[PDB]
Amino acid sequence: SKLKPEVVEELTRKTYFTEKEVQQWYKGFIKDCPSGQLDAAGFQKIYKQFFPFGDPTKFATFVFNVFDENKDGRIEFSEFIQALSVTSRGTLDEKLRWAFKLYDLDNDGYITRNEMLDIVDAIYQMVGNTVELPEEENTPEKRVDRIFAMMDKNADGKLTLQEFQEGSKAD
Amino acid sequence: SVPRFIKYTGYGNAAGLLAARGLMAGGR
Ligand SMILES: [Ca+2]
Ligand SMILES: [Ca+2]
Ligand SMILES: [Cl-]
Ligand SMILES: [Mg+2]
Ligand code: NA
């Protein structure tokens, strides 16, 4: 597991990681994925180990496809470390810009309510929901209805990145 | 106790945290 100096330097420059951190992530990545290419089955295995009695299939697939930047069916280390940099160390706006890319499942530039529900449902399917009374049931649908309406300031049934980014930010 | 972050489910932050944690597991 030896990363070429030019590659390390370039990946350091492109991320929030130091050169030392990049090389440490590479050693660990190659230890767990000796070929240097993480496939979708291996990615889902990670989440099944977290949540062995949920169903991570949907969430893993959605996130894998965003992480697989060149859409060759594999997460290579350059994709791994750049995805980890943004999701773990980005500013709030950068993290939400990444989340926008995840939620905009048809890549048409807007989040529609069906897309928001698909992600939220994928999350609950994996991790579970909070136990409530049958009459305050924590359903993704009612949660999404609330949040989506709050975010859709112009009520056109679709969320821009600007509308999405302002969702939890205080004014 | 509700998982502290799941209050952000649908806002983007929960998906980001779960994505990051899966990557981290994939490198450890
Ligand atoms: Ca790829
Ligand atoms: Ca869309
Ligand atoms: Cl989320
Ligand atoms: Mg469409
Ligand atoms: Na809108």
PDB file of N, CA, C and O in Angstrom, chain A residues 127-158:
ATOM      1  N   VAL A 127     -32.147   2.498   9.795  1.00  0.00           N
ATOM      2  CA  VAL A 127     -31.853   2.753  11.202  1.00  0.00           C
ATOM      3  C   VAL A 127     -33.068   2.605  12.104  1.00  0.00           C
ATOM      4  O   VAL A 127     -32.904   2.524  13.333  1.00  0.00           O
ATOM      5  N   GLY A 128     -34.274   2.573  11.547  1.00  0.00           N
ATOM      6  CA  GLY A 128     -35.481   2.470  12.339  1.00  0.00           C
ATOM      7  C   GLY A 128     -36.135   3.825  12.571  1.00  0.00           C
ATOM      8  O   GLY A 128     -35.600   4.881  12.225  1.00  0.00           O
ATOM      9  N   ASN A 129     -37.325   3.790  13.179  1.00  0.00           N
ATOM     10  CA  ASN A 129     -38.068   4.997  13.519  1.00  0.00           C
ATOM     11  C   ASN A 129     -38.308   5.036  15.030  1.00  0.00           C
ATOM     12  O   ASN A 129     -38.157   4.039  15.734  1.00  0.00           O
ATOM     13  N   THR A 130     -38.707   6.212  15.504  1.00  0.00           N
ATOM     14  CA  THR A 130     -38.978   6.393  16.922  1.00  0.00           C
ATOM     15  C   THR A 130     -40.360   5.914  17.312  1.00  0.00           C
ATOM     16  O   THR A 130     -41.348   6.295  16.679  1.00  0.00           O
ATOM     17  N   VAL A 131     -40.436   5.130  18.395  1.00  0.00           N
ATOM     18  CA  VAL A 131     -41.712   4.553  18.799  1.00  0.00           C
ATOM     19  C   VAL A 131     -42.595   5.655  19.372  1.00  0.00           C
ATOM     20  O   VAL A 131     -42.207   6.340  20.327  1.00  0.00           O
ATOM     21  N   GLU A 132     -43.793   5.822  18.808  1.00  0.00           N
ATOM     22  CA  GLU A 132     -44.744   6.845  19.233  1.00  0.00           C
ATOM     23  C   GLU A 132     -46.111   6.185  19.361  1.00  0.00           C
ATOM     24  O   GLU A 132     -46.273   4.994  19.080  1.00  0.00           O
ATOM     25  N   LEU A 133     -47.100   6.969  19.785  1.00  0.00           N
ATOM     26  CA  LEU A 133     -48.472   6.497  19.780  1.00  0.00           C
ATOM     27  C   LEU A 133     -48.948   6.308  18.337  1.00  0.00           C
ATOM     28  O   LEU A 133     -48.476   6.989  17.423  1.00  0.00           O
ATOM     29  N   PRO A 134     -49.902   5.400  18.103  1.00  0.00           N
ATOM     30  CA  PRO A 134     -50.399   5.192  16.723  1.00  0.00           C
ATOM     31  C   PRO A 134     -50.924   6.442  16.009  1.00  0.00           C
ATOM     32  O   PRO A 134     -51.136   6.480  14.785  1.00  0.00           O
ATOM     33  N   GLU A 135     -51.094   7.486  16.810  1.00  0.00           N
ATOM     34  CA  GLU A 135     -51.818   8.712  16.488  1.00  0.00           C
ATOM     35  C   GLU A 135     -50.898   9.906  16.410  1.00  0.00           C
ATOM     36  O   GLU A 135     -51.309  10.982  15.951  1.00  0.00           O
ATOM     37  N   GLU A 136     -49.647   9.672  16.741  1.00  0.00           N
ATOM     38  CA  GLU A 136     -48.527  10.520  16.442  1.00  0.00           C
ATOM     39  C   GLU A 136     -47.441   9.697  15.763  1.00  0.00           C
ATOM     40  O   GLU A 136     -46.256   9.871  16.040  1.00  0.00           O
ATOM     41  N   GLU A 137     -47.821   8.777  14.871  1.00  0.00           N
ATOM     42  CA  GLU A 137     -46.837   7.865  14.290  1.00  0.00           C
ATOM     43  C   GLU A 137     -45.775   8.637  13.512  1.00  0.00           C
ATOM     44  O   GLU A 137     -46.090   9.533  12.722  1.00  0.00           O
ATOM     45  N   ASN A 138     -44.509   8.279  13.739  1.00  0.00           N
ATOM     46  CA  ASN A 138     -43.378   8.932  13.079  1.00  0.00           C
ATOM     47  C   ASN A 138     -43.207   8.342  11.680  1.00  0.00           C
ATOM     48  O   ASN A 138     -42.361   7.480  11.425  1.00  0.00           O
ATOM     49  N   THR A 139     -44.029   8.830  10.750  1.00  0.00           N
ATOM     50  CA  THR A 139     -43.924   8.345   9.380  1.00  0.00           C
ATOM     51  C   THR A 139     -43.073   9.287   8.540  1.00  0.00           C
ATOM     52  O   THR A 139     -43.206  10.512   8.655  1.00  0.00           O
ATOM     53  N   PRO A 140     -42.199   8.756   7.678  1.00  0.00           N
ATOM     54  CA  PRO A 140     -41.443   9.644   6.777  1.00  0.00           C
ATOM     55  C   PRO A 140     -42.333  10.622   6.026  1.00  0.00           C
ATOM     56  O   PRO A 140     -41.942  11.770   5.796  1.00  0.00           O
ATOM     57  N   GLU A 141     -43.535  10.187   5.646  1.00  0.00           N
ATOM     58  CA  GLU A 141     -44.421  11.035   4.858  1.00  0.00           C
ATOM     59  C   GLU A 141     -44.763  12.328   5.590  1.00  0.00           C
ATOM     60  O   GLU A 141     -44.604  13.421   5.040  1.00  0.00           O
ATOM     61  N   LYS A 142     -45.247  12.227   6.826  1.00  0.00           N
ATOM     62  CA  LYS A 142     -45.669  13.433   7.532  1.00  0.00           C
ATOM     63  C   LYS A 142     -44.473  14.303   7.893  1.00  0.00           C
ATOM     64  O   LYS A 142     -44.570  15.540   7.886  1.00  0.00           O
ATOM     65  N   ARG A 143     -43.343  13.671   8.223  1.00  0.00           N
ATOM     66  CA  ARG A 143     -42.100  14.415   8.425  1.00  0.00           C
ATOM     67  C   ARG A 143     -41.708  15.184   7.165  1.00  0.00           C
ATOM     68  O   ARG A 143     -41.347  16.369   7.222  1.00  0.00           O
ATOM     69  N   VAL A 144     -41.763  14.517   6.012  1.00  0.00           N
ATOM     70  CA  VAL A 144     -41.364  15.168   4.770  1.00  0.00           C
ATOM     71  C   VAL A 144     -42.346  16.274   4.413  1.00  0.00           C
ATOM     72  O   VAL A 144     -41.946  17.354   3.965  1.00  0.00           O
ATOM     73  N   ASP A 145     -43.645  16.033   4.607  1.00  0.00           N
ATOM     74  CA  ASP A 145     -44.623  17.077   4.302  1.00  0.00           C
ATOM     75  C   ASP A 145     -44.297  18.361   5.053  1.00  0.00           C
ATOM     76  O   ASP A 145     -44.344  19.459   4.476  1.00  0.00           O
ATOM     77  N   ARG A 146     -43.968  18.238   6.341  1.00  0.00           N
ATOM     78  CA  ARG A 146     -43.623  19.395   7.163  1.00  0.00           C
ATOM     79  C   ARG A 146     -42.384  20.099   6.629  1.00  0.00           C
ATOM     80  O   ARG A 146     -42.413  21.294   6.299  1.00  0.00           O
ATOM     81  N   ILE A 147     -41.281  19.359   6.519  1.00  0.00           N
ATOM     82  CA  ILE A 147     -40.010  19.971   6.139  1.00  0.00           C
ATOM     83  C   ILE A 147     -40.077  20.523   4.717  1.00  0.00           C
ATOM     84  O   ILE A 147     -39.633  21.649   4.446  1.00  0.00           O
ATOM     85  N   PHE A 148     -40.631  19.746   3.782  1.00  0.00           N
ATOM     86  CA  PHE A 148     -40.666  20.212   2.401  1.00  0.00           C
ATOM     87  C   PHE A 148     -41.465  21.513   2.279  1.00  0.00           C
ATOM     88  O   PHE A 148     -41.029  22.459   1.615  1.00  0.00           O
ATOM     89  N   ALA A 149     -42.640  21.578   2.904  1.00  0.00           N
ATOM     90  CA  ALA A 149     -43.437  22.799   2.828  1.00  0.00           C
ATOM     91  C   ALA A 149     -42.693  23.977   3.436  1.00  0.00           C
ATOM     92  O   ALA A 149     -42.763  25.098   2.918  1.00  0.00           O
ATOM     93  N   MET A 150     -41.996  23.748   4.552  1.00  0.00           N
ATOM     94  CA  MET A 150     -41.250  24.822   5.198  1.00  0.00           C
ATOM     95  C   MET A 150     -40.153  25.350   4.284  1.00  0.00           C
ATOM     96  O   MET A 150     -39.881  26.557   4.255  1.00  0.00           O
ATOM     97  N   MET A 151     -39.520  24.456   3.523  1.00  0.00           N
ATOM     98  CA  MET A 151     -38.394  24.816   2.677  1.00  0.00           C
ATOM     99  C   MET A 151     -38.854  25.455   1.377  1.00  0.00           C
ATOM    100  O   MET A 151     -38.188  26.358   0.865  1.00  0.00           O
ATOM    101  N   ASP A 152     -39.998  25.024   0.849  1.00  0.00           N
ATOM    102  CA  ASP A 152     -40.491  25.509  -0.435  1.00  0.00           C
ATOM    103  C   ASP A 152     -41.116  26.889  -0.228  1.00  0.00           C
ATOM    104  O   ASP A 152     -42.338  27.059  -0.172  1.00  0.00           O
ATOM    105  N   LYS A 153     -40.251  27.903  -0.120  1.00  0.00           N
ATOM    106  CA  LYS A 153     -40.724  29.251   0.193  1.00  0.00           C
ATOM    107  C   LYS A 153     -41.689  29.768  -0.869  1.00  0.00           C
ATOM    108  O   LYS A 153     -42.670  30.444  -0.544  1.00  0.00           O
ATOM    109  N   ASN A 154     -41.432  29.467  -2.146  1.00  0.00           N
ATOM    110  CA  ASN A 154     -42.321  29.921  -3.218  1.00  0.00           C
ATOM    111  C   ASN A 154     -43.397  28.893  -3.596  1.00  0.00           C
ATOM    112  O   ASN A 154     -44.159  29.133  -4.542  1.00  0.00           O
ATOM    113  N   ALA A 155     -43.478  27.772  -2.876  1.00  0.00           N
ATOM    114  CA  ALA A 155     -44.585  26.810  -2.991  1.00  0.00           C
ATOM    115  C   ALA A 155     -44.833  26.348  -4.432  1.00  0.00           C
ATOM    116  O   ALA A 155     -45.977  26.185  -4.869  1.00  0.00           O
ATOM    117  N   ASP A 156     -43.761  26.124  -5.182  1.00  0.00           N
ATOM    118  CA  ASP A 156     -43.875  25.620  -6.543  1.00  0.00           C
ATOM    119  C   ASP A 156     -43.659  24.113  -6.620  1.00  0.00           C
ATOM    120  O   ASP A 156     -43.556  23.569  -7.720  1.00  0.00           O
ATOM    121  N   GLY A 157     -43.604  23.430  -5.478  1.00  0.00           N
ATOM    122  CA  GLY A 157     -43.479  21.991  -5.465  1.00  0.00           C
ATOM    123  C   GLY A 157     -42.102  21.460  -5.743  1.00  0.00           C
ATOM    124  O   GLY A 157     -41.976  20.284  -6.076  1.00  0.00           O
ATOM    125  N   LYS A 158     -41.067  22.290  -5.630  1.00  0.00           N
ATOM    126  CA  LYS A 158     -39.716  21.856  -5.924  1.00  0.00           C
ATOM    127  C   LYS A 158     -38.739  22.745  -5.175  1.00  0.00           C
ATOM    128  O   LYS A 158     -38.982  23.936  -5.009  1.00  0.00           O
TER     129      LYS A 158
END
